Amino acid sequence: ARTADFRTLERESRFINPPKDKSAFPLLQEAVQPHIGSFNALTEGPDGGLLNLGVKDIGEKVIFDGKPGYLGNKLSVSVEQVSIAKPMSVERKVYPSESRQRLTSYRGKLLLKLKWSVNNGEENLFEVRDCGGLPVMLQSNRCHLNKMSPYELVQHKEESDEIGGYFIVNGIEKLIRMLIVQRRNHPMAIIRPSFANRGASYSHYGIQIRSVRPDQTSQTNVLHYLNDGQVTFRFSWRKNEYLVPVVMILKALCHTSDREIFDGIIGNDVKDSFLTDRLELLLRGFKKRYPHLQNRTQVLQYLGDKFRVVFQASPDQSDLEVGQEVLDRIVLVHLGKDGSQDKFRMLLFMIRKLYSLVAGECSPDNPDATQHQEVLLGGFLYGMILKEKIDEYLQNIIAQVRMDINRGMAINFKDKRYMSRVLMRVNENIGSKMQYFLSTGNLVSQSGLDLQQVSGYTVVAEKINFYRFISHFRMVHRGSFFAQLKTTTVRKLLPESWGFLCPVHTPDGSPCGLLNHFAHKCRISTQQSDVSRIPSILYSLGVAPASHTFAAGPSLCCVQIDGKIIGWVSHEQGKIIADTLRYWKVEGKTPGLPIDLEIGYVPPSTRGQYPGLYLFGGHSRMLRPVRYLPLDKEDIVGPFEQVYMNIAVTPQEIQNNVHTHVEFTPTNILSILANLTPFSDFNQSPRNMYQCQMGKQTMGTPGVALCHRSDNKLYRLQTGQTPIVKANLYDDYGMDNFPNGFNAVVAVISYTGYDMDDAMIINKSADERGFGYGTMYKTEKVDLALNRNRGDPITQHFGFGNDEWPKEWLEKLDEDGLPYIGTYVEEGDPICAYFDDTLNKTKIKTYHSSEPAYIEEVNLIGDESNKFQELQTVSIKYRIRRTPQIGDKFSSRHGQKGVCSRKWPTIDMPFSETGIQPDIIINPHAFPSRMTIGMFVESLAGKAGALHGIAQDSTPWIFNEDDTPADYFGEQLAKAGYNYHGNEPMYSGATGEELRADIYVGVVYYQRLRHMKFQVRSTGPVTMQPVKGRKRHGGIRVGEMERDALIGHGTSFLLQDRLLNVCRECGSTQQSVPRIGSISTVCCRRCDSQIVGGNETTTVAIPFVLKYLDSELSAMGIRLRYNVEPK
């Protein structure tokens, strides 16, 4: 029957009785899923999540005792496990909204256990050494609201359906912004000129792979190519870089000979000349450069000695041991330990691609293309920085032991009291520094995480509107370094981003083209898939093992799983294998092959991308559902996989043999807010972007828990209605629980003449009925301990008495402790009174604001510690009523923003046959330039829905040209008995006569924005120039261009009044010191009667910046013959 529905009964039932089972609209849960999944996989993994793995692989920091080849005893400090602690104390749980009302942080507690092995397995001293309080994530594993019913959430002072990856620190609710980086285990080719500019003989070419350890730790490994003919491996450790020849590492990885390297780089391509000559040049160069380095152990020792302070190696460490450690830790880290046999096999593949890049047989790969892009989640960065801080903490205890050895000379290395002395002298504020990182966004580390930004990783994550709040969790940022970059091509909307990033949702302005948003129904796999058995089934098909036979080059389809070369096969067989693997992945009924397996087969290409089949179990890769034609079952596809897949956007357009997938619901390639726009297929793309940017600026419905949500600003809209033309999935996302805007009876008519460009007019009566009554909630913190220190209680405390404090303060500052809740605070009103003993009298706090407000909620905050004292900490909330005056920006859902031109009186407003007087008037001239047919269609469908009672759905790509929405809604209007085109006849409100033509009138959804400014001064605050600031009663600066405009008109006196309104002898002051009863005279030292000074100085008219300039030059030691004019 009906295409959509309001579901009023369901909405009211849900409002009255929150569900006690699985929450409704699950899509929101699997829309905030990536953050929750990341934070859970940080601890909820196969073996201690990722934190235990990371701390296990942190290292074995060792220092040696000075006990007289031996030196003393070791320390072998390690870390065993990291635990969870959500509540806070006699132990009690602490739910969120705490430290929200307190305006503090919602932190957990970090349990840390370490080792004190004095030597190899002799005396191990385990100890739990908890380090501060970790700021945990809401709705995550480490939160009391982990798996709660919506009813339980309602019970625990929480939003009826609350979800969020934001961290509550200082009561600010910040969030880790997502970042997008290179892939994990894929070596790509780069032709950036910076490689050539690195130094002499450097080329533009070079392979790059951003490998990641099983704890998701990045490590770059670049292969620059030199013009002479040698290839130089490059990496980075600490904050610096260290470069080494490639063949050095090739020979160090395994006990393998040069002819084997020849076969590895060139397989059956002996008749090639370019490759063979380049390889022979490389081998001869290595042989002549390092003749002594023959033995594999010898080259290992060479590496160890070349890198001894580079890796902070312990003095008791053999050179072979150090070399093995460095080539196990810093190169091809994603292959892990004991995989050196494959690490040697990977470089032979990486080199051959580089020579293919040199010869041009392979095309480069765009770093900013989504094929090779990849997003790391908030949780992963949290774990990475935590591991870095733990490693730094171990380094710090090592340094403290070193200092004690240097000076203290009181060492035991086997005494618990000694351990206590050591630990008591180091910092255990790991949680505190994590809180600082969340609060500021300033990343500080030694390794640098192979990132590129420094400052800015946490966004405030405001909740102006529910739309903006939910959008905070879907934005992916390219990088602040890219933001500083001025190249346009990075900001292009690449086709490869089809189905992953929203083509529409993008802020307009400076960050345009950068803050992309993921499409809805796009998931990030925050979990390593079961990739163990994949090689086994892969060997089942027709392949060859990576070790039995040697064959390289693009002529053979390389096969690798997450960076492990495992097989080589022809390209035809590679395509067959890719298709069969697709069959078995979507078909199920296979112990391995998870459905979310990103598999990419690049066919052989003429001068194209480098061939070879690829598989990616992945740990942060992007995923996207899509139907699979041969089985009509859901299939998952990634970006790298998509480029060579023949998707069809509709089942209608599925051709023969040119399609295998069809993304059902083509609306899925879009942001949530973009899908919320009605009839996005009838507007102009800039207008769609304007709408997306405007919706996040709305006077929204922040939530329902606003009773206790003390924050800086809320912008709560008092009323609100569902859209009569609501898009489908508006209800499916539970957006109805956060309605904003109102249905307005709009009239596309040029009547008043007070609206030509973008202005609009509201009906004065409709405003008086309360058309839109958004209100502002503002809280600020008031306390007296900001200057108080720990051991010094303040002489001043709340209240007031036993003084001669001014009367009339009991107007609103009337109680023993605080003002009344219900009061109308004017400017300068007594906000709160504190009795002070320092002055032995009470003092009060002024309002210090602009608009008079009403107190909404005053709450008492207690110290987290047992600091009973006198509770010198109070938080109060201001309620501000924002009735829509003129100039307040309203807008529709199509970017047709405008300001309230004038509250047109109802009688003068034009009316219709039915007697309805439209409330919102817009000028028809906007549309021909704006080109938003969506506004017209929304008006038409809104009238039809308001008449028939039904709800109209506005989903893009549901009206074919043969099913025109104009005709579809005209049929409904005709059957309802109204004008087919919506043109309702109307009569003027002043003359009372009928208008020339029937007016286009309908109902549309209208949103109020928060951009509500005027400043004026005559005298007051003041180089003697007026101060800067609207709120400081300042002035306005007359800029240089304003001065030029003053000159251009030739208005000399005008310029003088806008920029305004001496020692006679020296001409470059000093005067006015009367002695007894004489008038003021001059005694300029630079120059009784003239004592010796001078008596030549008279008043002149000059700016008072001149005296400051004179004094500055006097300090500068520079003086000029300032020719003082005569009388």
Give the one residue of 2, 1011, 1043, 1107 binding RNA; rule: CB under 7 A. 1011
In the range 899-938, which residues lie near other proteins by CB under 8 A?
914-919
CB crowding 641-658: b at 16 or more within 10 Å, else e: bbbeeebbeeeeebeeee
Give the one residue of 949, 1074, 1077, 1117 binding other proteins; rule: CB under 8 A. 949
Q: Answer yes or no whether residue 89 interacts with other proteins by CB under 8 A.
A: no
User: Please, which residue, 697 or 952, has the CB nearer to RNA?
Assistant: 697
The least CB distance from residue 881 to other proteins, in Å, is 11
Stretch that binds other proteins, among 13-21, 416-424, 597-605, 619-627 (CB under 8 A): 13-21
Is there a contact between 806 and 819 (Cβ–Cβ < 8 Å)?
A: no
User: Please, which residue, 169 or 1084, has the CB nearer to Zn ion?
Assistant: 1084
What are 183's two structure tokens?
């892939």
Give the one residue of 857, 888, 938, 953 binding other proteins; rule: CB under 8 A. 857
Distances (CA, A) of 670 to 666, 735, 894: 9, 17, 16
414 binds, among RNA, Zn ion, other proteins, none (CB under 5 to 8 A by kind): none
In the range 677-716, which residues lie near RNA by CB under 7 A?
693, 697
In the range 511-530, which residues lie near other proteins by CB under 8 A?
none
**Per-residue contact string for residues 510-549; x = within reach of RNA by CB under 7 A:** -x--------------------------------------
In the range 1025-1054, which residues lie near RNA by CB under 7 A?
1027
What is d(CA 1065, CA 605) in angstroms, rounded to the nearest whole number?
Answer: 89
Stretch that binds other proteins, among 97-105, 489-497, 638-646, 660-668 (CB under 8 A): 97-105
In the range 444-483, which residues lie near other proteins by CB under 8 A?
none
Residue 317 C-alpha from the chain's centroid? 43
Give the one residue of 270, 359, 460, 1038 binding RNA; rule: CB under 7 A. 460
DSSP reduced 3-state for 72: coil
> Half-sphere exposure (CA, 13 Å, Cβ side) for 59?
21
The least CB distance from residue 464 to RNA, in Å, is 9
Q: Answer yes or no whether residue 898 interacts with other proteins by CB under 8 A.
A: no
Cβ of 288: how many Cβ atoms within 10 Å?
8
Q: Identify the bridge partners of residue 564 per DSSP, sorted by sequence position.
A: 561
The least CB distance from residue 804 to other proteins, in Å, is 21
1087 binds, among RNA, Zn ion, other proteins, none (CB under 5 to 8 A by kind): Zn ion
Q: Answer yes or no whether residue 1023 interacts with RNA by CB under 7 A.
A: no
The least CB distance from residue 866 to RNA, in Å, is 33
In the range 102-131, which residues lie near other proteins by CB under 8 A?
102
User: Please, which residue, 453 or 906, has the CB nearer to RNA?
Assistant: 453
The least CB distance from residue 858 to other proteins, in Å, is 5
Q: Which amino acid is at 680?
A: S
What are 190's two structure tokens?
């780069």
**Per-residue contact string for residues 142-161; x = within reach of other proteins by CB under 8 A:** ------------xxxx--x-
Cβ of 523: how many Cβ atoms within 10 Å?
17
Which H helix or E strand runs over 188?
Answer: strand 188-189
What is d(CA 796, CA 870) in angstroms, rounded to the nearest whole number?
Answer: 10
Is there a contact between 249 and 231 (Cβ–Cβ < 8 Å)?
A: no
What is d(CA 111, CA 91) in angstroms, rounded to the nearest whole number?
Answer: 16
List, in order, residues 6 or more apart from 1115 with CB less than 8 Å away. none
At 1094, phi and psi to the nearest 5? -145, 165
User: Please, which residue, 529 or 722, has the CB nearer to other proteins?
Assistant: 722
**Per-residue contact string for residues 780-799; x = within reach of other proteins by CB under 8 A:** -----------------x-x
Q: Answer yes or no whether residue 551 interacts with other proteins by CB under 8 A.
A: no
CB crowding 1-20: b at 16 or more within 10 Å, else e: eeebebeeeeeeebeeebee
Give the one residue of 266, 330, 759, 766 binding other proteins; rule: CB under 8 A. 766
In the range 990-1009, which residues lie near RNA by CB under 7 A?
none
The least CB distance from residue 1045 to other proteins, in Å, is 44
Is there a contact between 616 and 562 (Cβ–Cβ < 8 Å)?
A: yes
Is there a contact between 953 and 729 (Cβ–Cβ < 8 Å)?
A: no
Distances (CA, A) of 645 to 518, 626, 755: 20, 11, 51
Least Cα distance to 96 among 169, 43, 150 occurs for 169
511 binds, among RNA, other proteins, Zn ion, none (CB under 5 to 8 A by kind): RNA
**Per-residue contact string for residues 710-749; x = within reach of other proteins by CB under 8 A:** --------xxxxxxx-----------xx-x--xxxx----
In the range 861-900, which residues lie near RNA by CB under 7 A?
none
User: Please, which residue, 84 or 483, has the CB nearer to RNA?
Assistant: 483
Q: Answer yes or no whether residue 480 interacts with RNA by CB under 7 A.
A: yes
Is there a contact between 475 and 496 (Cβ–Cβ < 8 Å)?
A: no
11 binds, among RNA, Zn ion, other proteins, none (CB under 5 to 8 A by kind): other proteins
The least CB distance from residue 946 to other proteins, in Å, is 4
In this structure, the chain runs to a length of: 1127
The site for Zn ion (CB under 5 A) is made up of: 1063, 1065-1066, 1084, 1086-1087, 1094
10 Å CB burial of residue 755 (0-12, 13-18, 19+) is buried
Is there a contact between 878 and 856 (Cβ–Cβ < 8 Å)?
A: yes
Q: What angle do CA 862, 863, 869 make, to 5 degrees?
A: 85
Give the one residue of 60, 98, 130, 908 binding other proteins; rule: CB under 8 A. 98
User: Please, which residue, 85 or 444, has the CB nearer to RNA?
Assistant: 444
User: Please, which residue, 156 or 841, has the CB nearer to other proteins?
Assistant: 156
Task: Name the CA dihedral angle for 947, 953, 954, 960, rounded to a multiple of 10 degrees.
Answer: -100
Cβ of 808: how many Cβ atoms within 10 Å?
9
In the range 805-844, which residues lie near other proteins by CB under 8 A?
815-818, 820-824
User: Please, which residue, 481 or 1104, has the CB nearer to RNA?
Assistant: 481
What is d(CA 31, CA 23) in angstroms, rounded to the nearest whole number?
Answer: 14
Is there a contact between 558 and 660 (Cβ–Cβ < 8 Å)?
A: no
The least CB distance from residue 1011 to RNA, in Å, is 6
In the range 990-1029, which residues lie near other proteins by CB under 8 A?
1003
> Half-sphere exposure (CA, 13 Å, Cβ side) for 429?
8
Q: Which DSSP state fits 1047?
A: H
Which residues contact RNA by CB under 7 A?
Answer: 455-456, 459-460, 480, 507, 509, 511, 693, 697, 1011, 1027
